[PDB]
Paper text:
The human diphtheria toxin-like ARTD family contains PARP and tankyrase (TNKS) enzymes that can catalyze both mono-ADP-ribosylation (MAR, mono-ARTs) as well as generate elongated and branched chains of poly-ADP-ribose (PAR, poly-ARTs). The PARPs and TNKSs form a family of structurally and functionally diverse enzymes, which are involved in the regulation of various key biological and pathological processes such as DNA repair, cell differentiation, gene transcription, and signal transduction pathways. PARPs and TNKSs use nicotinamide adenine dinucleotide, NAD+, to transfer an ADP-ribose (ADPr) unit onto target proteins or nucleic acids with the release of nicotinamide. Here, we report our contribution in identifying a set of compounds based on a new nicotinamide mimicking chemotype,triazolo[3,4-b]benzothiazole (TBT), able to inhibit different PARP family enzymes with submicromolar activity depending on the substitution pattern around the central core.
We previously screened a compound library from the open chemical repository of the National Cancer Institute, which led to the identification of the potent and selective PARP10 inhibitor OUL35.27 From the same screening, a TBT derivative OUL40 (NSC295701) emerged, showing an IC50 = 3.2 μM against PARP10. Indeed, when assayed against a panel of two poly-ARTs, PARP2 and TNKS2, and two additional mono-ARTs, PARP14 and PARP15, IC50 values in the low micromolar range (1.2–5.3 μM) were obtained. In addition, π–π interactions are present between the inhibitor core and tyrosine residues.
Numbering used by the authors:
A (entry chain B): 1115 to 1161
B (entry chain A): 952 to 1111
Write the structure that this text describes.
């Protein structure tokens, strides 16, 4: 794995073309995330 | 040491996790190629992941980050999608769950849009789709996402 940019704990991928997109995030330490909920789902075919 | 506690659909905790799943679906520029064509999900089950060791590992590192950032962990609830979801809930996040060819370099990626994490459940760009039908848009096969507590601390802001 890489390291965060000097002085930083994570990167924020801020969307700058797609109006509707929300942010993506990257951490470089596994210890900086905890998997709190396992969600089991199906995607649904629209009308 | 992991145990999965099944949450009742009548539980407000189930309800607010389902709402974050459903309300953060968007359209994708790939028109559904990677994660399929859908506007919403059938939630089948929501389990709380409980591991003493992985939790203490997380809060240790969160204290380190907050002390480096004016007592601000900058903690978020973010979606993660991976075919190794079962190894993640048991052994926690590490180097083997990094995306090495990612835009922001070799790290562990998370998303505010559930439908973005959904693109990654069968692999990079949806891989070859569900193991049973080889369908990236499978409406039959059960999918799994994680909703994770993520410490961002001081985030480096990269524009597209
Ligand atoms: C480049 C990249 C790779 C994986 C990934 C994201 C972005 S956002 C997300 N949510 N779950 C997995 N992922
Ligand atoms: Zn399938």
């Amino acid at each position: 794995m890489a390291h965060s940019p000097p002085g930083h704990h994570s990167v924020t991928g801020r969307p700058s073309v797609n109006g509707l997109a929300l942010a993506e995030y990257v951490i470089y330490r596994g210890e900086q995330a905890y998997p709190e909920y396992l969600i089991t789902y199906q995607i649904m075919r629209p009308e | 040491g992991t145990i999965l506690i099944d949450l009742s659909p009548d539980d407000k905790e189930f309800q607010s996790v389902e709402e974050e799943m459903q309300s953060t679906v968007r359209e994708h520029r790939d028109g559904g190629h990677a994660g399929g064509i859908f506007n919403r999900y059938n939630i089948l089950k929501i389990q709380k992941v409980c591991n003493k060791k992985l939790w203490e590992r997380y809060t240790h590192r969160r204290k380190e980050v907050s002390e480096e950032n004016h007592n601000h962990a900058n903690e978020r609830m973010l979606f993660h999608g991976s075919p190794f979801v079962n190894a993640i809930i048991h052994k926690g996040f590490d180097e083997r769950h990094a995306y090495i060819g990612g835009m922001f370099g070799a790290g562990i990626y998370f998303a505010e849009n559930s439908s973005k994490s959904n693109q990654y459940v069968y692999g990079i760009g949806g891989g070859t789709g569900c193991p049973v039908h080889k369908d990236r848009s499978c409406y039959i096969c059960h999918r799994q996402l994680l909703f994770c507590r993520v410490t961002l601390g001081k985030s480096f802001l990269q524009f597209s």
